[PDB]
Each structure stands twice: as structure tokens, then as C-alpha cells.
Write a protein that binds this DNA or RNA. Structure first.
Ligand code: NA
Ligand code: NA
Length: 327
DNA sequence: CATTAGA
DNA sequence: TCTAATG
């Protein structure tokens, strides 16, 4: 967590590079397990050699550990950090809609900058057009204060369209968070569950709702179960307009909500932890349900959930307010 | 790890 | 169809 820090960081730097600028899936995967194992180890790596005794730790990485150990750096790392092309790719990627593949492809073409991107808006897709469009607001955080305003409106039309809807705004926001990155809305409806052959409209109705009023301003992607877009709060009585904010609404079988709600609400650790426990408590938790464990090795059979509590009761734990679902 | 776009 | 990109 800190005794092996440099090592792990340097390593991940190494991994991330192969993955992105290069297409070295393996080297990349290589650095990662290493960077993983080294992070576990209870003592100060005092040398490669030492390191090397490790699993996934080869001659390759060991070599790298010495160099870092010995001198406060690494050339390969210094070289890459310098490298404009590679630099490039790292940057372009910030564009929403821009991934490694494309990143390299643009580079190859010579589109390296923000501006480059503009000049060739044609070379970009709608997703990427939008990303480009809202590059600044996309990177900007969302003050809870706003999360509150957004949430309010959302729940409002939700209601307006059909009073039988249920939406929860999951994430860190859900967890108290002074600020969020985007807003995550989990949706469901009684008239939709596991078997009941969809109702794409169910999703559709609301998206439309939200648009009709101006909350939704663009579409990144709209499917029958998962919309992905952009939104904005009505710029008041002038002098102050709101920044464009990523938003995601998703449909869900009413018979799957809570687990999904619980889950998306995290935190990553709260989850992992709670999950670990359901194992002992003779269960299995996953993004959609909660199954009782059968000694044979495994088992099935989805227990019934009507609240965040049911899942709790089930594993006989303490109901944790989302506030303190931190870990 | 599943859903969407796209070509 | 596959392949990329989000989460
Ligand atoms: Na080894
Ligand atoms: Na990106």
C-alpha cells in the first residue's frame, strides 16, 4: 500500500503503456499481475532478485525493479513520458468515444490535437462528435448540489409519464459523495421483469420525456434497455448556464432492481466485502440476484427481493445506510 | 461483462 | 459479423 508503492506505480505505468500506445496485450497483462503480486508482498522489495522470487516476476520486470531501485527513475519510463506520439494517444483517448484503437488511428493520420480533431470533425462519429463537443464539461466534476437538482427533475418526469416507475440514482451520489462524475439512473417497472418479454417503450417513454422538457440534449446511445446521453440544468435567469453532463438511464426487470441497485451503489469494496460474506452465510450475490449455495460445490435458485433490506436479512447483516456503504 | 454503433 | 467503446 506504500512500502511497495513506486514499484507498483511504475509497473502500472509500464502496463498502461503497452496496452495503449502499443498493442502488447500480453506485456501489458504481464506488468499487471506483477504489479499486483508485488503489491501484496509484505516487505520492502530490496532488489529485483528478491522481487523475482515472485510469481509473474520475471527476468524482464526484475531488471526493471533494480533500475528503479538503484536510480530514482527508469529510462523506458522517461523516454515514453517524453514521446510525443505516445503522449498523443494518451490525450486523444480523453475524448469520449475515443479509445486506443482510434487513438492510434488518428495519430497515424496526424490528428494529434484538440484542434486537429476539430478540423476533421468529419473523421469522427456522432459519439466522438459529441465527446469533442463537450470536452471541457465532460471532464468537469458534478457538485452534489447539482446532483440534487438533476435528481429532482428526473424523478419528476419519471413520475409524470407513469406513476408506476421506480428510479434510483445510484453511484457515489447515492453514497453521500460531495461530487460525482456523471449521473447514474437505474430504472424499473413492475410491468417488466425477468420473463415478461420487454417493453422497450418503457425505456423510450422517459427518454422522450426528459427530452421534451430539455433535460436531455443529446444521444450518445439509445438501446432498448440502456440509454446513454448528455444533459443540462436549465440555465437560470441568465449570466450562468450549466455545463453539459453525461447521463445514463437503464431499464431493469422489477424482479432484479435491489441487487442491481445495491450493487451499482457500491462502493467497490463494500460490495466485494458484502459479497464475500454472503459466501459464508451460504449465498451468492451478483449484479442481478442472490442465490443459496448448495454444498455439491455450487447451487442456484434466486431468492426473492423487494428491498435492499431483503438482501441484508438474507445474509443476516446489519442494514447499512448507503451513506456508510463506503467499505 | 454486457450493451450499442458501425461498417 | 466482428470490433470497438462505455460502464
Ligand atoms: Na518467479
Ligand atoms: Na476516451
Amino acid at each position: 500500500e506504500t512500502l511497495n508503492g513506486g514499484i507498483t506505480d511504475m509497473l502500472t505505468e509500464l502496463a498502461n503503456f503497452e496496452k495503449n500506445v502499443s498493442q502488447a496485450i500480453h506485456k501489458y497483462n504481464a506488468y499487471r499481475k506483477a504489479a499486483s503480486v508485488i503489491a501484496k508482498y509484505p516487505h520492502k522489495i530490496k532488489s529485483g532478485a528478491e522481487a523475482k522470487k515472485l510469481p509473474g516476476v520475471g527476468t524482464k520486470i526484475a531488471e526493471k525493479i533494480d533500475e528503479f531501485l538503484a536510480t530514482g527513475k527508469l529510462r523506458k519510463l522517461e523516454k515514453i513520458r517524453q514521446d510525443d506520439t505516445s503522449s498523443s494517444i494518451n490525450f486523444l483517448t480523453r475524448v469520449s468515444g475515443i479509445g486506443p484503437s482510434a487513438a492510434r488511428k488518428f495519430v497515424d493520420e496526424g490528428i494529434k490535437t484538440l484542434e486537429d480533431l476539430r478540423k476533421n470533425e468529419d473523421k469522427l462519429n456522432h459519439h466522438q462528435r459529441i465527446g469533442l463537443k463537450y470536452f471541457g464539461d465532460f471532464e468537469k466534476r458534478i457538485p452534489r448540489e447539482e446532483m440534487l437538482q438533476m435528481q429532482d427533475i428526473v424523478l419528476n418526469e419519471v413520475k409524470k409519464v407513469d406513476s408506476e416507475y421506480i428510479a434510483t440514482v445510484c453511484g457515489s451520489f447515492r453514497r453521500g459523495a460531495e461530487s460525482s462524475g456523471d449521473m447514474d439512473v437505474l430504472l424499473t417497472h413492475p410491468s417488466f421483469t425477468s420473463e415478461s418479454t420487454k417493453q422497450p417503450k418503457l425505456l423510450h417513454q422517459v427518454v422522450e420525456q426528459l427530452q421534451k422538457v430539455h433535460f436531455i440534449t443529446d444521444t450518445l446511445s439509445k438501446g432498448e434497455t440502456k440509454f446513454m446521453g448528455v444533459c443540462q440544468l436549465p440555465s437560470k435567469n441568465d449570466e450562468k448556464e450549466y455545463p453539459h453532463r453525461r447521463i445514463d438511464i437503464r431499464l431493469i426487470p422489477k424482479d432484479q432492481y435491489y441487487c442491481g441497485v445495491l450493487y451499482f451503489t457500491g462502493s467497490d469494496i463494500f460490495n466485494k466485502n458484502m459479497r464475500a460474506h454472503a459466501l459464508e452465510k451460504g449465498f451468492t450475490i451478483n449484479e442481478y440476484t442472490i442465490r443459496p449455495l448448495g454444498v455439491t460445490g455450487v447451487a442456484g435458485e434466486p431468492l426473492p427481493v423487494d428491498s435492499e433490506k431483503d438482501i441484508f436479512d438474507y445474509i443476516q447483516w446489519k442494514y447499512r445506510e448507503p451513506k456508510d456503504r463506503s467499505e
